[PDB]
């Protein structure tokens, strides 16, 4: 919410002045943040998914979509349709809340945070960063932790290119080493 208002006025203002745009609609929004945990050990510990799911539920307040193996992959000993992961999509007020929480609490709390990347865009201005420790998030109690499973995060933006993606994120004060 707070970070959304900060966008709507200050970041939209600076982005318009920076890109020389004719329409406010032509500035990057953000679609969603999809938090993914490709557990891949559920085949070993079926329970380990409900515990990992319990953690995305913890970090972001949505029950997670427990996703299944799209097709059979024998190398990883997984068939088609087995629940080898769990994800959440955060969009809207809730996405803005989580985004604020991340940037203001967890991105500093990473182990000796030497910085984030600046190339982790698909090629149209959609960021994708992966965190190596679940503990960085405040929500975790460590009173209910099995292991130190990290996760990744995709900031899906309506941006046109990687330049607009970087512009939008840096505008939000992303560390961006």
């Amino acid at each position: 919410a707070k970070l959304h208002d900060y966008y709507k006025d200050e970041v939209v203002k600076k982005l318009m002045t920076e890109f020389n745009y004719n329409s406010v609609m032509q500035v990057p929004r953000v679609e969603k943040i999809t938090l993914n945990m490709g557990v891949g050990e559920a085949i070993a510990d079926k329970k380990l998914l409900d515990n990992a799911a319990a953690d995305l539920a913890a970090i972001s307040g949505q029950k997670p979509l427990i996703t299944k193996a799209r097709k059979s992959v024998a190398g990883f000993k997984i068939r088609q349709g087995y629940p080898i992961g769990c994800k959440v999509t955060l969009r809207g007020e809730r996405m803005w809340e989580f985004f604020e929480r991340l940037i203001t609490i967890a991105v500093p709390r990473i182990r000796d945070f030497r910085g984030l990347s600046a190339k982790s865009f698909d090629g149209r201005g959609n960021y994708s960063m992966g965190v190596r420790e679940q503990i960085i998030f405040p929500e975790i109690d460590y009173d209910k932790v099995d292991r130190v499973r990290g996760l990744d995060i995709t900031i899906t933006t309506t941006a046109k290119s990687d330049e607009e993606g970087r512009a939008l994120l840096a505008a939000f004060d992303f560390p961006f080493r």
């Binding site: 919410a1 707070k2 539920a57 913890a58 970090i59 972001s60 307040g61 949505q62 029950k63 809730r94 809340e97 604020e100 929480r101 940037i103 203001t104 609490i105 991105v107 500093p108 709390r109 945070f113 030497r114 910085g115 405040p138 929500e139 004060d173 560390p175 080493r177």
Partner: protein, 66 residues
């Protein structure tokens, strides 16, 4: 969103040691009081400037004898 499947998501205050206190509607369960923040962090405001209040100070500076 749906009901009776999502955790509790009330409004919680998180206060860091440098005076950065942030209001965030979050899912923790009770008040929070953290140490680092997006402000009181080296790489976030001053990467070659910042100060700390821990193993670089308590453990060493408090006992320092120079």
């Amino acid at each position: 969103m749906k009901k009776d499947i999502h955790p509790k998501y009330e409004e919680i205050t998180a206060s860091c040691s440098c005076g950065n206190v942030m209001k965030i509607r979050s899912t923790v369960g009770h008040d929070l009081n953290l140490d680092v923040c997006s402000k009181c962090h080296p790489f976030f405001t001053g990467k070659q400037r910042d100060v700390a209040t821990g193993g670089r100070v308590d453990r060493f500076n408090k006992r320092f004898n120079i």
